[PDB]
Amino acid sequence: ADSDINIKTGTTDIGSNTTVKTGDLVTYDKENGMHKKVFYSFIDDKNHNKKLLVIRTKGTIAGQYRVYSEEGANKSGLAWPSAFKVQLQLPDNEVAQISDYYPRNSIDTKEYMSTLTYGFNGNVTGDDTGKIGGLIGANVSIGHTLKYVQPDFKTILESPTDKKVGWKVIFNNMVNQNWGPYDRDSWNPVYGNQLFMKTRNGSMKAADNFLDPNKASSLLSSGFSPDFATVITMDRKASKQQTNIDVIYERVRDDYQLHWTSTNWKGTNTKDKWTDRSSERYKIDWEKEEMTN
Amino acid sequence: ADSDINIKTGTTDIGSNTTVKTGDLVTYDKENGMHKKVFYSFIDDKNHNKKLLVIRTKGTIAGQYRVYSEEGANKSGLAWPSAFKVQLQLPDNEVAQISDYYPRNSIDTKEYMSTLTYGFNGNVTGDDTGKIGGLIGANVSIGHTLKYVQPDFKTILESPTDKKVGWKVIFNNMVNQNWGPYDRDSWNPVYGNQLFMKTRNGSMKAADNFLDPNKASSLLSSGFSPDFATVITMDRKASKQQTNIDVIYERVRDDYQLHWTSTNWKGTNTKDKWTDRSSERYKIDWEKEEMTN
Amino acid sequence: ADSDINIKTGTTDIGSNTTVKTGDLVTYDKENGMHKKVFYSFIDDKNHNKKLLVIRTKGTIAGQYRVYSEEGANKSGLAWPSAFKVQLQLPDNEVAQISDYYPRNSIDTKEYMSTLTYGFNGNVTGDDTGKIGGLIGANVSIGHTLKYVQPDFKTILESPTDKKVGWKVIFNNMVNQNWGPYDRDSWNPVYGNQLFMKTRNGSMKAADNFLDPNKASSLLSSGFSPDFATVITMDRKASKQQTNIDVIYERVRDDYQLHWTSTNWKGTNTKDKWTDRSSERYKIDWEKEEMTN
Amino acid sequence: ADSDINIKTGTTDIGSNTTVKTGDLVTYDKENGMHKKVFYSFIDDKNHNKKLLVIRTKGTIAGQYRVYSEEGANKSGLAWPSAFKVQLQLPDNEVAQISDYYPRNSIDTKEYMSTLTYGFNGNVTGDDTGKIGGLIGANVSIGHTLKYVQPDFKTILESPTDKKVGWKVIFNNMVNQNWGPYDRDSWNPVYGNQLFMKTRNGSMKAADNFLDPNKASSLLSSGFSPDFATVITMDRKASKQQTNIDVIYERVRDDYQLHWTSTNWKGTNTKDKWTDRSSERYKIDWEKEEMTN
Amino acid sequence: ADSDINIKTGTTDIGSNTTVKTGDLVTYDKENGMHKKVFYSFIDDKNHNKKLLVIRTKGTIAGQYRVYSEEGANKSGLAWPSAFKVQLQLPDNEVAQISDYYPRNSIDTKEYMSTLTYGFNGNVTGDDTGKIGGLIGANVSIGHTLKYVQPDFKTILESPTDKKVGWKVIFNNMVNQNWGPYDRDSWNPVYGNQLFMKTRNGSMKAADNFLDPNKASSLLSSGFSPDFATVITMDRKASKQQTNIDVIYERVRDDYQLHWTSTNWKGTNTKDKWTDRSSERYKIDWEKEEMTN
Amino acid sequence: ADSDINIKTGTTDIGSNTTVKTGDLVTYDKENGMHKKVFYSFIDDKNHNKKLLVIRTKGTIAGQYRVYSEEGANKSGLAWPSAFKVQLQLPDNEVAQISDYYPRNSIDTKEYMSTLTYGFNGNVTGDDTGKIGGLIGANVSIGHTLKYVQPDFKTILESPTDKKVGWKVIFNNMVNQNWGPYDRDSWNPVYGNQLFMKTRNGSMKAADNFLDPNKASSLLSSGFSPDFATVITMDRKASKQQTNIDVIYERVRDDYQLHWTSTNWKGTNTKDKWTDRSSERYKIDWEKEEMTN
């Protein structure tokens, strides 16, 4: 908070009384199904120390959630997106540097509750024959409650060096058919990994027995569209005013297979089965304030 | 957040010191009952890289929730809107590209709560005859609670390629007469799919035994009015400054029928029975900044 | 959100650097008790495509909640407002069109909660005579909880065509004397529809045995005052610059009667008994920018 | 929402580039204890259609909560404010009209919750003599929960005609000594109406046995200060530019009496016992833009 | 709050009508994996008393969560970041001083709830043989509930002297596999410290039996990126206008080892095992308003 | 609220169209460990009545939480900050006066909840031999629930006279190892004051058996940094334009000692054991608008 140090709000920010030359570059990778896009903005504030360039890799990455193989009615497979990644890198010989990046790791909290209860009790029982009985009782109770919120997908910022910064979205866990959340490492001795399982002991075909993509999370089938911002600073006295960047949009898929053993369906998951990578190299012209490729 | 990178807020946005020529085109499709409307805005910022055009397909799509067929008092049908869709497409030979789209898939969260309780107990019982009894007891309890919010209709952004982007609204589930939520795949061995069922064993006519549209969701009967935004960018050095777009407003209906078997009503659902499509082609004139059709 | 597409906020809106000529027309219908009023605004933005006119039918519609007929102390009736409606229409031969309308159908949500509990138990019982007993037990519990919010009156946007758009407010349900909510179709074999019932087996007169209007919802007795906005767009090259509109303020009342059968009061409801309609025709002068009637 | 129709926010409002001549008139009615005050504002926007005048009857109405009569220690009375009212009226021959009024009836909502629970149970009991016993059990549970918020006093807008508009504040219910809420119609066969009762079977004097005004609601003793706004529109071509208004500040009191029957206090309430009215007539000069009286 | 003293908001802040010369310095420490960065801003307000310089050590510190040693399948180790620290210091002979620092210790609250319950009970039991029995009972209950929120990592502001100010982020506690939260001092006689334990009695390799970094907190593996602000004030009449600062980015790691004793895994933690320090010295030029190193 | 009296917001505030000369004075007391700092602002509004000076004693006071004495393993002590204070005073002969002070005592609320439950019960029991039994029962329950939020440290504004105003922060209570909150006056016949106790019957050294400062509140070890604002007004016609102020930053510590009696640790607290005071005198020059010392 700028106002908590008694400084007037917005005083220390950069971008005042200057013209920024924005831009846009859109490309679609048919092979990998990644509609990648970057939105750049050249800021050169005279009162600042270095030339600035903020890059927002908005884009979009598809989900690719479908059944890849079926072998009769006994067994079938499934490929689902385990993780989405997007990273930027600079050549080792480059002179520019990575300064900031908005989406960053944040500390997560949890509730906690302690309960203590005392009790007392007493009743008098009687019947027709004149018998009279008594009872005096007491009890204690101690309870601990802990609650927290867990998303389906969890975004993470991989440790950014001077040259490369990258983010990552992973599959935390999912609730299937209103039952307890499952994850990739979940296991059951009878049924196994019931993550994407429709019916435990259905009589349908193996390929048919898979969770409807509508029921599952949206990011599994329709994909994940990132919104990540990074700024590159270049010294204004550098000999060479041209810079190259690489943008990668890799996606990791897992293999989920269910098998009909004797009576019930049994599901098995094989993590990190395939990876699809789409890297494109851009060129920066600091003197002309334009990025083109 | 622009202010989290120490950049002054609003600096990187586009649209400063320029005139945007907005517009409006309204058309009604009597056959399909779709009051489609698009709101365009031509932005040509000199400091930007490409000419811009944001298209907001506000429009409105009717619900069409009515009983289509009745066969005596024994059985009758019902047609209800299973899903609403709206998509924009560009010709394969076109030079413009799709850049951004506001309504996008978002990660959904869930609560979770773990409870543990210890207990102790002890009572002393006595009667008139001098008998004295005792009792010492203890107990443990473990509980897991998981809660989440689920809407009636769920909007999804279908995987957007370079040329076409489309959205989709599907029927998640509905609560009928304050009872447990039902969906298209819900089944009961006795009654079946009780989604749009008034009384389980009523004596009325089959056509009469259907849930009142007022009781059901508003989107089923009065329809769904979208609000989706997409921006198309065209290079300012292109040889041809004219572009064509296609806008589709398809709606998918399902067949719900209840049948009087012997004593109670039995309901069955047949998903994706009909689809109504309304496509219109617009022409864009980048040089004159007007879209007309 | 305009800022989520990287466009500067407010850039795509219409109404900049222009003068709008507002207005007001107020009329009271003594026969129907409807204080109708419309607030118009002529917007002609040069950068826009069509002339604009936004109409806000604020007005007010009375409730008319009273006992219409009494027949001794045995039975009496009651008329209450089941639904309020207001709609605008254009002639079929007109050239203007309906573009937008603010209050629109919105998707409803609901909470859901799944609980699972394991238990264990064990006690030791003894008496004076040296008898020693034991007990070991366990239990499981599964619970489903679903909660949602339901208003007394539910506003709905009837499917708007190109020429006419109309809204609707209906009676969802009401809580009577802190008891479970009742609606028009509620039935009880003994008492019947206990919606507007004061006492189940009171000895008072039939006309006296009705729920106090203060206890009931405000809209039943003091009426409902709408606030609905619609915009009409007319091509600026049209030959005729005069337009006619019709505004309707219909209100639907139901007949609720309770009858003293032998010991207790029995209530019956007859939906859609009366309808009061108040239609007035306005004239639009686009050239002079004034609506008068 | 103005921004939801794509119109720039604040465009359709009235009051731009004009001077409003406000004012204030304060009067105190010693007989009725009503500190009435009105705050007017003359708005004449050229771009508008009619001359405007918004009147805010802020004022203040006292509570008058006191014991009026006592007859020994056997019985005593109490007068408390059952309802506060304030209304404006215009002469039937007047040409001005009532257009708008801010505080208006609003729809009220309620929560609802449905619960279902399954259970299972089993224990093994044994004693010293070798006897072994068993027990297997199960249970079901269905629960309905409904919660809502109810204020002590409820403001209502009486059905406004073209010439007169009036509001109303009534006594919904009150919680006495942390016990269940009571209202004017509450009855108990033993104690009666225990609304303003201190002790059920106290030995104090009848006049002394009344709830402390500090314990009760503030509006009962210190009164209710309204804040209601209304706008009057007059055609600018009218022959006569002078208008008369009447402002009433009526307050309704009830009679609460408790009686010592044999052992306990019994309370009875007589609604609408007294009404205090304070009407003042103001004169409007549209040409000079001043209201004086 | 400035407005709560009747002073116009923002009047007492500093930074009005002046130019601030910001800057940026980025450096990466490959040996320690700390991407440190500082963002300075020179403010010299004529109406103020001293020259100002606010330093924001944004940077980023990696997590370094990995298994360092394995000795067969019997035992293995783990190094995890126990605490992150970042501190600024000034030479003892310097003339500048530390004035303010935004992130500061804050008081934390907790809920509390007291419950009291009275009960009564009575049943009548009878059988075929005409025996009649009775039972009258009562009970009391007292309960205390206390709940609070506890984060995984807790930021602390170490006692700031005139020359040096430093912050600190420590490991409060973590929830492992949805079980009760553990911390560094947690101990169990059977299993020990089960903080980073996968399975209590798994048969896998010791190195394999460790909690997945994705399952654990993000700061453990991907590191912590600080955002801390400090302002240094220097008298404008000082003889020497050059100042030196030191910035440290130390990180503390702990040694977590689990051992297979006979049947189950036993975990032991050794706090404060390693510390990695990265100190860099900057030079301040108040006359030229630039910090370079 | 300024806008609730119909006055334009911000009209009555002071500071418009004037220049304020701010300042800063920083000093560190090595002996007491108090980094005291004051931020002044001279406001002389011509439309106001007196010259103004708002003083914000931001500063910082250390915690000083450490073990002062140990006597073998049998007993040891502990000094912890019981209360932090900061106060400003003016000489009795001075002409300036204290006008306002932002942090002020506020009324605190509490929830309350009353519950009432009715029940009914009935079961039929039978066995193989044909015996049939019955049981009819009922129960009532009344419950009172009261919940509130209590912070660890509570700030208080000591009664401000014309010349001196001072604040105070005291130790309300603390939760130790997730157990019930303890305070300075808490006592247990067996263990005593268990406020800063690690283990009830641990075998470690007495000095070692103390709660970790990280586990305890942050203000205990890292100290409390105040933010308090006060404004001094001086008549502009006074003969003498120089004023003196005194600022005190006293801190009060308590003595907590635990003693090993025979089997368990016993803790005793001695409140108000030490007080550290740091007073500095400043000089105000109203004519030159500068405070220096």
Curated annotation (Swiss-Prot), chains A, B, C, D, E, F:
GO terms for molecular function: identical protein binding; toxin activity. One of its GO terms (cellular component) is extracellular region. Keywords: Cytolysis, Hemolysis, Secreted, Signal, Toxin, Virulence. InterPro entries: Aerolysin/haemolysin_CS, Bi-component_toxin_staph, Leukocidin/Hemolysin_toxin, Leukocidin/porin_MspA_sf. Changing residue 259 to I/P/R/S: Nearly wild-type oligomerization, hemolysis and target cell binding. Alpha-toxin binds to the membrane of eukaryotic cells (particularly red blood cells, RBC) forming pores, resulting in hemolysis, with the release of low-molecular weight molecules leading to eventual osmotic RBC lysis. Human RBCs bind much less alpha-toxin than do rabbit RBCs. Heptamer oligomerization and pore formation is required for lytic activity. This is Alpha-hemolysin. The lineage of its organism: Bacteria, Bacillati, Bacillota, Bacilli, Bacillales. The gene is hly.
